[PDB]
Structures are given as structure tokens and as C-alpha cells.
Amino acid sequence: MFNNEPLEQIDKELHDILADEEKRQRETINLIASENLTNGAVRECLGNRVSNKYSEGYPKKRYYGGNDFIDKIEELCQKRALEAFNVSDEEWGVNVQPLSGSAANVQALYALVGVKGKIMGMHLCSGGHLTHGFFDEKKKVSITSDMFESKLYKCNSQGYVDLDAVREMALSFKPKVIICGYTSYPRDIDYQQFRQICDEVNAYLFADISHISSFVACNILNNPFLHADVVTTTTHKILRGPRSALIFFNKKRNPGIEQKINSAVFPSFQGGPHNNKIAAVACQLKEVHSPAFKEYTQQVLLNSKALAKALISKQIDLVTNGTDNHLIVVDLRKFSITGSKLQETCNAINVSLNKNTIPSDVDCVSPSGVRIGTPAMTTRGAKEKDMEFIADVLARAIKITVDLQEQYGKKLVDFKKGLPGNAQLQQLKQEVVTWAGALPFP
Amino acid sequence: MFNNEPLEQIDKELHDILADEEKRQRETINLIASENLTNGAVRECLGNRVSNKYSEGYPKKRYYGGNDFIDKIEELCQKRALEAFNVSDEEWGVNVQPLSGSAANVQALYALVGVKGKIMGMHLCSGGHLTHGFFDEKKKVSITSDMFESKLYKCNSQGYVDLDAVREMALSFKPKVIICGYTSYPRDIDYQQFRQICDEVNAYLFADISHISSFVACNILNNPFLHADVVTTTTHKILRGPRSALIFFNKKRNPGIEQKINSAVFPSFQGGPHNNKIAAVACQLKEVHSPAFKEYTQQVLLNSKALAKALISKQIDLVTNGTDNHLIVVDLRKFSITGSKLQETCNAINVSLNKNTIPSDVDCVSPSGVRIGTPAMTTRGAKEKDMEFIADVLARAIKITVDLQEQYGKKLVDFKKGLPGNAQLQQLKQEVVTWAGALPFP
Ligand SMILES: Cc1ncc(COP(=O)(O)O)c(CN[C@@H](CO)C(=O)O)c1O
Ligand SMILES: Cc1ncc(COP(=O)(O)O)c(CN[C@@H](CO)C(=O)O)c1O
Ligand SMILES: [Cl-]
């Protein structure tokens, strides 16, 4: 007593928009550092009937029965996860049930410190995430600033983690957890140095490696598992999995942490796990362990280095003057334009990027930079030689943005009016669409 | 630069378990009240590339661009949701971004009352949900008892909502929100009477209709939208959508509640939405509005009443002695066996049900009932005539549980040891599999 007909027939309206979205994705240079493209195998898992199943609890400890095949899945996932992050099932556990990055951070932080607990994270404007305790003046923007009491460290005017001010704030504030690993940070992290600070104050060490997860797994960047009490990561970014998150906890360093994490997740915050997510994560983590994926992650870095260099060769300033990873932040002051405008300009030419604040930006109102990343384009088969074109396209957009601001003024509402019809952008869009459209596409 | 080969080829290990799980679902009488089976179109949407997209924010108000086809999807979903629940976009708004029911309740409750705020909900043992403020003595089990201050009302010894005790409690406690709509409640709800109580104390009316959502959409049961400030529902249960949740808010009664709900969701709790969930909800909501779905929901009710009647004709007791909805709770005292045991016995015969407490149960240790529901079986084509067989299978299972408790004792560990190899269970399992395996299966 149901409808069997394909999505096409059952709902042609939705299939219209979905087919369109697919086409935009195919015909875009996607530089959103936090984006990637899933293969059909990860998407078969997301569309699998395994999500019919209520499975509150953990393997071998379910509230409901009929959960044998689900137990095997969740365990296959936890194993594949510990293997991928080169870490022993005797020193480290994983929780695979967090529905997304933000959920996973809220949960882990609660487990460690509880309500009213004291947390420290990098400010959003300096490259930290919302769930690292972000707040405005009096307005507690993130639950992590309201549920916990939080203080935000900044980067120095060069764009690097101000480790000294982290100390000067740590002793001042006496936190129970300090978070590192970031939303927009183009360099590697000194986990060791964060460990030093954390000991001095009896604090937990939280590493959110969501953006750099692959580097950590493939031993290309610093290992946080050597110093961290908890590591969290999303699975949809450089990891190239589904939209989901993982919580890692060092038991061999921390008393009953397995308990605190696993019950923060359920039943403190979540109910039924989404088993299709768990299935999809499992499938990707297998790929993650293959050396073919290490080949991919390397290519992500080589592309990022080549893009940084080529942008610099066109006299474009980069925050920290380069990259250690997948992510670049362009400082635009030199051209007297906002990241706000440049985003709008790149939208018109099917180039996906987003505005990003720079150290000298006081407010978050009109950021002077943009964040770009290479994982999605690397997935589509772009190599170093291809980074010059992307760099050139970006430089053309920067210049156009300069011209269009000279005609229509500084206020963004006005600027946007200059975008449609512009002969140049229409020509630049087609170059993009033609090169982007014909790239490998999972 | 990716692996394109089907899940079958790329990962044979996972495909095995998934095919197994699928076979288990086909060969099971699934009586889990909160479970259903999604059609192929809902699963195509869950497996769609729309989840490659970061879409933090709301339609026309995103942080990143390239979000035009996402915006159309989220709006097509919000529309279809208001339509389905027979409510106008001028009095009521929706948020379609909560990842699951628990997140949705935590989010809605914070939006209304904030940290340290006061909430009333039905106790779990009485039929309430974890996110309705659940706690043990000193042990804040659910975040909803920790980040809020919560007090729990019970049901009377007949199994009904003790509206009088709710008053006795509302005046003593003075909460900012009272929750109704339940995990395990076999009767309709007096929303009007909850409204009256909330007025007397200046509290919000929160209705979680996750279990009965379809009934409310098809004007088959009482309408909470008439009296409630906030209505939450999951989409994976009787609604028969994906694993996701909806938050409804009465703006034409409540100030800037549109803002308060929408920002509790993002950026307080969540980050990027899971657009594939949004897409899948959109698709199911279309189906929900069809009169064919009203037919299905009616059948759910008829089947449920037929099952209750048949159980009673075989001298089996039911809490409240019947049902108004999809859900029955069997009282087992009469037989001196637990729900815990019957669950285990029903597992052995591919009959999915879960244990459930009755009004006279002191603790959660060893509940004296089971909860069953009809949505899943109705989806698989079962009609009123078919309920007799299901009732008969349950009666035979109750009897076997009685015989096995007599042979192996009362402690559950010992009892389970009696299950494997039992000639009767193997015979009864086969009867189940034969009839279950050949039922329509989306
Ligand atoms: C470092 C970090 N950690 C967590 C998250 C949350 O992921 P969700 O699945 O969206 O909850 C993010 C998200 N980052 C976005 C911006 O918010 C991005 O585009 O980088 C993150 O960066
Ligand atoms: C009434 C009600 N509200 C919320 C939830 C939470 O849904 P999740 O999607 O699991 O977060 C439930 C869940 N119900 C389970 C038992 O907890 C069920 O089998 O009934 C719910 O009932
Ligand atoms: Cl999903």
C-alpha cells in the first residue's frame, strides 16, 4: 500500500530542480574549501533501506532487537575509522553516531565539561568554528557560548595562532577544554604546543580536524592523536564522505571517557542513529585507507601549493603568504574591494568561493578576504597545470570587481546591480562552464 | 580522481551486510510503532548529489552563493509542510532543517525558554520521550533535564494523562513550556485542556506529534495546531518520510518566534543543513497531501483497532483497554512475564516489537508491557483480516514465553538460553517468514 514509481514520475517538480542542481555542480569551479563530491557508492549507502531501523544504543547494547546486521555495520565503521586514523582500538575509541560536525562538537564538549563548564576556542573571525564557543557582544550566537562559558583567542596580525596569547588567556580564564583545528586556517597546527598549555591548567585538549582530516589520516600533516584527549571530524569535507561526524577519545589518557562521550551522544543529545550515514561513512573509510586516496590527498596539497604560488605570481596577497594544506585565504585590501563583492562576482561566473575575514578586519560586517580550497576540484581531476587557469580566472574576477565598483559604488546592494548582463562576466562564465562541464564528475 | 564502481564492487563486505539487513526487513512482522518503510523515491532523494552543498542559513539568506536550486528545494518543502498540516503560511511557519526529532525538540525548547529555563513533560515510563525532560534521581539522563530545569508528570493507573496532576504541578512549578504528544501513548490528546493549563501559568504549548503526525494531517485525530504555540514532528515514523524533523511555530500568537526558532536551529545548534533530507521530506510531504495517503492512514487506524480487538478476544489486556491511534500497549501482568522477555521471544520468531512500561511499573528495570504499532505492516499491504494472524502469533509467543520461564527461571540471562533450538519457535518463525517474505515491499 505505497507508491513504487521512480522520483521522475512520482514528483516531476522536484526531479526538475534536482536535475538543475546537478547541472550547476557539474558546470562550476567549486572552491568551497569545505566541499567535495561523493561517489555513487557513498550515495547508494545514503539511499539504502538500512535507515528504516531504530537502533538507539550501541552495538551489542541496543534497546530494541532485530539489530544484528546494524551492529555489524556500526562496528565495521568504528574499526575502519580507528584504522584510517592510524590509531589503536586499545588506546582510542570512536563514536560514529553524531549527525553532523556541530552536533558532534556540542556533544563532545558537554561530555568533557558539562553545563556552565569553561571552554576556550579560536574566534570565528580568526578562523574558528561557531561550535568553538562563538559569541557577539552580549548575543550568545552559538549554543557553545550559552551552554558553556567561553573565551575566544585570536590570531596575530600575520594570521598565525597567537600561542602566547592562548597562554596569557588560559591562566587568566582557567578553562576545562581548549579547542584547536579550524574552519578557515591555511597553516598546520602545533598540537604539541597546545598540549603544553593544557597541562599547565589541567585542561582537556580538543582537536577539531574537520577541514584537514585527510592530511592527518595520510600522515602528511601534524598528528593530533599524539597529544589530543578528544578529536572530532566531519566526514563530508576533505574526507569525501557523507554528511556526518566522528568523535575520537583517548581512553588510555582519560578515566571513564568512553562512557562520557557515548552517553553525551545518546541519550543526552540524540535518539535513533541514522544508519545510512553510518553505512556511508564505513564505505568511505575503506577508500580512505587505500593508498590511492593518499595519492588523492597529496594531489590536494600539490594543487593548493600551485594555486597559492600562481596567485602570488599575479601579485595577489595571501594570508600567511601561503598554505600548508588545502585552503588559501586571499587578502584583498590591496585592491580596495570586499570578499563580499568578490563572492558575488564569482557567483556570476560559476566560481564557488566564500568571503572570509582577515586579521585587520575589526567586525564581521564586510570581510576583506576570501577562502578557497582544492579538494572538490582535485576530485574532478584537476592537476597543478590547471591551477594557473583557476588563478587567472580569479584574477580576472578581482579586476572586474574593481571596475564594477568604480561604476556603481561601495555599497554591496548597488554593486550587485552591475553584475547581470556584463559582457565580460558572460564571456568568463562560458570559459568556466566549458572547462568545468567536461571534467570527471562522480 | 575517484572510484566510480558500484557499492557491490567497491566494497563487497558492506554490501553483504546491507543485503542481509534488507532480507531481515522483508521477512519480519515489524510491529515497531515508530518504524516504517520508505519508497524508492524517498531513497533516491536521500542518495542525491544535493548533499554536496553547504547551505548554512535560510532561503534567500544564505552565507554562501550557488544556493538557488537549494533555496527552491527548502521552500518547496516548507510550503508542502504547511499545506500537509492544513495550516496557512500567514499564521504558521516551519523550520525544515532539524536533523532528527531529538535535535528538533532540544532546538525548539531552547528557542522558547533558554538555558536554565523551566519545562514540563510526560515521564518516559508513562509514555514521554527522552527530550521531554527525562531524568533519574540526580542523574540528568537527557540534556533536556540538564540545560533546562524539568519536572515530569505521570499518567493515572488506568493509563491516561492525569490532567488534574498536570495542573497540581503547573501551579507548583510555573514552567515556561508544557509538552504533550508522546512516544508511547495509545490514545488521542486533549490539546484544548493543555492550552487551558498553560494559560493559567503563562506557559507555551508544545505538541510533539511525531508518532501521530499523519493522523493530524488527515483530520482523523485532534488538531494541536488550534491550541499549540509549537508543534514538532519527526518524518520517519507514521509520516513515512526520511529520518528528519519539522518545527512548526504559531507566529500569529507569538512575537518574534520566527527568528527565535530559526536561529535556535542555526546558528545556535546546527551548521550546514542536510539538503538531501530536505529533498526527501519535500517528496514525502507531497505524498502526504494526496487523498491516497489519507486512505493509508485510515488503514493504519483500522488495522490497529482490529489488532486490539483480536488481542482482547484472546484474553490479552491492553493499557486503556484499546487504542485511538496506531499504537497498542499490551499489559502482561496476567501472565507473569516481562516485556523484556517477550521482546526476546519475538526476536526469535522475526516479530519486531519493543518492551514498554505500564502505570504500575515502579522502575525501568523490568517493564510489564510491550508496545506494538501498525504503520509498517499496513505499508506492506496487511488489512483487518490479517490482524487476527498477527494477534494469534503474539498469543503463541506469550504462551511460549510462559513455558520457557517455567523451564529456565525468571532472570533474563537464563531465559534467553531457552530460545535457540526450541522446536516451537523455529516452526512459528517459519510461519512468520513465509507470510512476511511475500508481502509488498518498497
Ligand atoms: C572546523 C569545523 N567543525 C565543524 C563544522 C560543522 O559542520 P556541520 O556538518 O556543518 O555541522 C564546520 C563547518 N564549517 C563550514 C562553515 O561553518 C565551512 O564551510 O567550512 C567546521 O569548519
Ligand atoms: C515523540 C518522540 N519525539 C522525538 C523522538 C526523537 O526522534 P529521533 O529521530 O530518534 O531523535 C522520538 C523517538 N522515538 C523512539 C523511542 O525513543 C520510538 O521508537 O518511539 C519520539 O517517540
Ligand atoms: Cl542522511
Residue numbers in the entry:
A (entry chain B), B (entry chain A): 1 to 442
Sentences from the paper on this structure:
SHMT is a pyridoxal-5′-phosphate (PLP)-dependent enzyme that catalyzes the interconversion of l-serine (l-Ser) and tetrahydro­folate (THF) to glycine (Gly) and methylene tetrahydrofolate (MTHF). The enzyme provides activated one-carbon units for the synthesis of dTMP, choline and amino acids. Plasmodium serine hydroxymethyltransferase (SHMT) has recently been shown to be vital for parasite growth and development, making it a potential target for antimalarial drug development. The overall structure of PvSHMT was found to be very similar to that of PfSHMT, existing as a twofold symmetric homodimer with two catalytic sites.
The first was a crystal of the binary complex of PvSHMT with l-Ser, which diffracted to 2.5 Å resolution and was obtained in the presence of methotrexate (MTX), although there was no density for MTX in the final map. The structures of the PvSHMT–l-Ser and PvSHMT–d-Ser–5FTHF complexes were used to assess the amino-acid binding pocket. Key interactions with both d-Ser and l-Ser consist of two components: hydrogen bonds from the conserved residues in the PLP pocket (Ser100, Ser102, Thr183, Asp208, His129, His236, Tyr′54 and Gly′272) and the amino-acid pocket (Ser34, His211, Arg371, Glu′56 and Tyr′64). Although the stabilizing interactions are from identical residues, three major differences between d-Ser and l-Ser binding can be observed. Firstly, the salt-bridge interactions between the Arg371 side chain and the carboxyl group of d-Ser are distorted, at distances of 3.0 and 3.2 Å, while two ideal salt bridges at distances of 2.7 and 2.8 Å are observed to l-Ser. The d-Ser side chain is oriented away from N5 of THF and is found in the extended plane of the PLP ring, while the l-Ser side chain is perpendicular to N5. Differences in the accommodation of l-Ser and d-Ser in the PvSHMT active site may account for the broad substrate specificity of SHMT and the lower catalytic efficiency for d-Ser in the THF-dependent catalytic function. Nevertheless, these observations indicate that the overall amino-acid binding site of PvSHMT is sufficiently plastic to accommodate both the d- and l-isomers of the substrate. The crystal structures of complexes of PvSHMT with l-Ser and d-Ser–(6R)-5FTHF revealed that the arrangement of the residues in the amino-acid binding pocket is restricted by the configuration of the bound amino-acid substrate, leading to different catalytic efficiencies towards each substrate isomer.
